[PDB]
Amino acid sequence: YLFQDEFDGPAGSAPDASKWAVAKQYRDDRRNVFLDGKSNLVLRAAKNGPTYYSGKVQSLWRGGVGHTWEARIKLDCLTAGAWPAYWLGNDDQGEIDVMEWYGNGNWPSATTVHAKEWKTHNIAVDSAWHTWRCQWDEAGIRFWKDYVDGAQPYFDVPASSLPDWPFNGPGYTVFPVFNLAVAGSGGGDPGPGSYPADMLIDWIRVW
Ligand SMILES: [Mg+2]
Secondary structure, eight states, X not given: OOEXXXXXXXXXXXXXXXXXXXXXXXXXXXXXXXXXXXXXXXXXXXEETTEEEBOEEEESOOBOSSEEEEEEEEEEOOSTTEEEEEEEEOSSSOEEEEEEOOTTSSSOOEEEEEOOXXXXXXOOOOSSEEEEEEEEETTEEEEEESOOTTOOOSEEEEGGGSTTOOTTSTTOOBEEEEEEEEXXXXXXXXXXXXXXXXXXXXXXXXX
């Protein structure tokens, strides 16, 4: 693999500090961002009195065009207020939102490519383990859920379809992000929700 983390390690420990920056409400607290000892990174949103704390990690590694990206994710957080997301970010222009689920009761879970000009596709996601695959090459960006050899992508965004396509710029790269947001537009009010809520990631691989 060009980049991977299998999130192996003792229960309660931090994700690999050579690969991830833990967002510092997000906090760098092992109660909210921790390896579970069973090969998963856990991002946990928890209520501390009136206040919610949760977790987010950003990859220190950035990858460019021509690769396939896949993560295995379990959403134990499909509740009001919660907003789990797996995305490939860029500081400047563009974003690949591989998988988002919204706790606001209004927006369907979806995959979205942003050029600046965006394309979105609704996805179903429940609380079971699923894999989420993104191939991003010169010609476009396409996606699979629970890939098996020869499966067709559920969503294909040709580079040509978005005139302001940033992704073929020289040296353009993206960083993987996993986060479990609470409230905001996508999460809605967490009051009626069930906390603590967990987003689990078994692995991310890029090749
Ligand atoms: Mg693992």
